[PDB]
Structure 1
Amino acid sequence: AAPYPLAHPPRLADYLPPPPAADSAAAVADLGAVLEAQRLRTPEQVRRVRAHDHPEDNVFPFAGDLLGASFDKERLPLTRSFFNRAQENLVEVLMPAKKHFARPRPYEVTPKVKPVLPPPEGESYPSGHTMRSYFKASLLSMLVPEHHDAFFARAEEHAQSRVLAGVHFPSDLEGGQTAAAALVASLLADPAVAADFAAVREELRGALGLPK
Structure 2
Amino acid sequence: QPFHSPEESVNSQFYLPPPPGNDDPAFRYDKEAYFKGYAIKGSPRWKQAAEDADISVENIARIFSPVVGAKISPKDTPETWNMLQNLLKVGGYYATASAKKYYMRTRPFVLFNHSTCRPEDENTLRKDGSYPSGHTAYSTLLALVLSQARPERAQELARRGWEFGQSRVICGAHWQSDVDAGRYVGAVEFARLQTIPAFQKSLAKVREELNDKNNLL
The equivalent of 2:2 in structure 1 is 3
In the TM superposition, residue 130 of structure 1 has moved relative to its aligned partner by 1.2
In the TM superposition, residue 62 of structure 1 has moved relative to its aligned partner by 3.1
Q: Counterpart amino acid of 2:57?
A: E
RMSD (Å) for aligned C-alpha atoms:
2.4
Task: State which of 128, 135, 138 in structure 1 corresponds to 2:134.
Answer: 128
1:12-69 deviations in Å (ceiling 9; x for gaps) = 1123111111111221111111112212344334344334625135542231112335
Task: State which of 98, 103, 114 in structure 1 corresponds to 2:105.
Answer: 103
In structure 2, the residue corresponding to 1:185 is in which secondary structure?
Answer: helix
The equivalent of 1:172 in structure 2 is 178
The equivalent of 2:96 in structure 1 is 94
- Alpha-carbon contact 1:11-1:97 (below 8 Å) kept: yes
- In structure 2, distance between residues paired with 1:209 and 1:107: 41
The equivalent of 1:50 in structure 2 is 50
Matching of residues 28-43 of structure 1 within 5 Å? 28-43=28-43
- In structure 1, distance between residues paired with 2:212 and 2:44: 38
Q: Counterpart amino acid of 1:153?
A: R
Cα distance, 1:17–1:4 mapped onto 2, change above 3 Å: same
The equivalent of 1:64 in structure 2 is 65
Deviates more, 1:127-136 or 1:34-43: 34-43
- In structure 2, distance between residues paired with 1:33 and 1:107: 12
- Runs of 4+ deviating beyond 4 Å: 207-210
Q: Which has the higher helix share?
A: 2
- In structure 2, distance between residues paired with 1:58 and 1:40: 23
The equivalent of 2:84 in structure 1 is 83
In the TM superposition, residue 86 of structure 1 has moved relative to its aligned partner by 2.6
Cα distance, 1:189–1:207 mapped onto 2, change above 3 Å: farther
Task: State which of 196, 210, 215 in structure 2 corresponds to 1:204.
Answer: 210
What is the count of residue pairs matched by the alignment? Answer: 208
Q: Counterpart amino acid of 1:3?
A: P
- In structure 2, distance between residues paired with 1:86 and 1:157: 19
In structure 1, the residue corresponding to 2:56 is in which secondary structure?
Answer: coil
Cα distance, 1:115–1:200 mapped onto 2, change above 3 Å: closer
TM-score by length of 2: 0.83
- In structure 1, distance between residues paired with 2:151 and 2:68: 12
Identity fraction in percent: 29
Gaps of 5+ in 2: none
The equivalent of 1:14 in structure 2 is 14
- Alpha-carbon contact 1:98-1:124 (below 8 Å) kept: yes
Q: Counterpart amino acid of 1:86?
A: L
- In structure 1, distance between residues paired with 2:57 and 2:151: 25
Gaps of 5+ in 1: none
